[PDB]
Each structure stands twice: as structure tokens, then as C-alpha cells.
């Protein structure tokens, strides 16, 4: 539990997002400007920060392929060698051959 909190606090500190490098030409907000809008505005989707998104998405990818390996090695089985192919007698006549 001590190690759990340690790694949890280590990940958290590293992932805290930095301000975005805006790829758009917007003004600077006037200084001292607080909340102007309200919560009835059309909801804006809550998006993970890039670092966090990579971490969880990477955990998902590592998870699905490790799950694929677990199924392949434990749940599934390999083909045993094919049965020996011995000479066998074919039927004497085709069932539809006129007599």
C-alpha cells in the first residue's frame, strides 16, 4: 500500500498538464477576468490531457495483447499430429450405378 501510494503520487505529479500551445490566433483574456458564462451552456466534452491519454491508451494496448497471449497459451490448445493415413478400401460400387 505504501508503494501503491508512492507510484500513484509519482504518476500523478508527472502527468499534470501544462498550458496548451494554442494552434489558433486568439486574444489574451483581459487581466482580472473571472467566470462570465454559466453552467447552462452547451456541455463541452471533458478530454484527458495528452500524457494521461497516452498512458491509459497504452495500458489498454498492453492489456489486449497480453490477454490475447493468455488465451493462446492457456485457454487454447495446439493441433496434435494428424492421424496416420493408412490405405483403406473404397466402396465397391457407386450407390447410383445401374445394376
Amino acid at each position: 500500500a505504501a508503494v501503491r501510494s508512492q507510484i500513484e503520487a509519482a504518476v500523478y505529479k508527472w502527468t499534470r498538464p501544462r498550458p496548451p500551445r494554442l494552434g489558433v490566433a486568439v486574444p489574451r483574456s483581459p487581466p482580472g477576468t473571472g467566470i462570465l458564462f454559466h453552467t447552462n451552456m452547451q456541455t463541452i466534452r471533458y478530454s484527458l490531457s495528452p500524457k494521461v491519454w497516452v498512458l491509459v491508451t497504452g495500458a489498454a494496448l498492453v492489456g489486449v495483447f497480453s490477454g490475447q497471449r493468455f488465451a493462446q497459451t492457456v485457454l487454447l490448445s495446439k493441433n496434435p499430429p494428424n492421424p496416420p493415413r493408412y490405405r483403406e478400401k473404397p466402396p465397391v460400387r457407386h450407390p447410383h450405378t445401374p445394376d
Binding site: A25, P27, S29, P30, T33, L36, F37, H38
Partner: protein
């Protein structure tokens, strides 16, 4: 690509410290099938239909200007249902440019 109108920081500076974003409802109201009166005849039911047009509605802002019902295409600008003759006065598509001529001004 279109990304909205450009804003200069000077235009974002309030004239009072209590200014917030105006909370005006842009839901026009509660509606349903247009309900005609039995007493009304064909002519008076036509008047009723013409008075229930959503595209004739607007929202008035705090300064008295109104934001109208707007649409990307002119299909939503005719009366519903569409009358026989719709655009008698040619709809005007307003283009903007920076050109000007002196005759329009006076000193």
C-alpha cells in the same frame, strides 16, 4: 477554414466589473401540431398558419436588437407548408468588401 470572427483583447474589456454573459433563452417556446379552430374557414385557417411560422420568430437582446431564426439554406425561409409563389422579392445574399466610394459620404 472558418474559425469564428477575430477578436482583439481591447474588445474583451468590460465597462463594468459586474458584466457577465446575458442569460436569454433562445428556445422559442413549446410547440406541437398547429391547432386550427373548427369555426375558422379556409381563409381564416390560412391566416392562422401564417401566424405560427417559426422562421418569423426572433429573440430580442438587452440592447433591443433581435437575433432571428436563421438557417444554412433558404429552404427554411419559405412559409410552412410552402406556398405556390415563394420568393416574389428576390432574396438578397449580402456580400461584404472593403471597397468604398466618395459619393456615399458627406463632410
Amino acid at each position: 477554414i472558418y474559425e469564428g470572427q477575430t477578436v482583439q483583447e481591447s474588445e474583451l474589456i468590460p465597462q463594468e466589473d459586474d458584466w457577465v454573459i446575458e442569460e436569454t433563452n433562445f428556445c422559442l417556446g413549446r410547440n406541437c401540431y398547429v391547432r386550427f379552430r373548427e369555426e375558422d374557414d379556409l381563409a381564416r385557417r390560412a391566416l392562422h398558419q401564417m401566424d405560427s411560422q417559426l422562421n418569423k420568430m426572433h429573440t430580442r437582446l438587452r440592447d433591443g436588437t433581435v437575433i432571428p431564426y436563421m438557417s444554412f439554406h433558404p429552404d427554411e425561409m419559405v412559409d410552412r407548408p410552402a406556398p405556390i409563389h415563394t420568393f416574389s422579392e428576390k432574396p438578397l445574399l449580402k456580400w461584404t468588401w472593403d471597397e468604398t466610394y466618395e459619393e456615399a459620404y458627406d463632410d
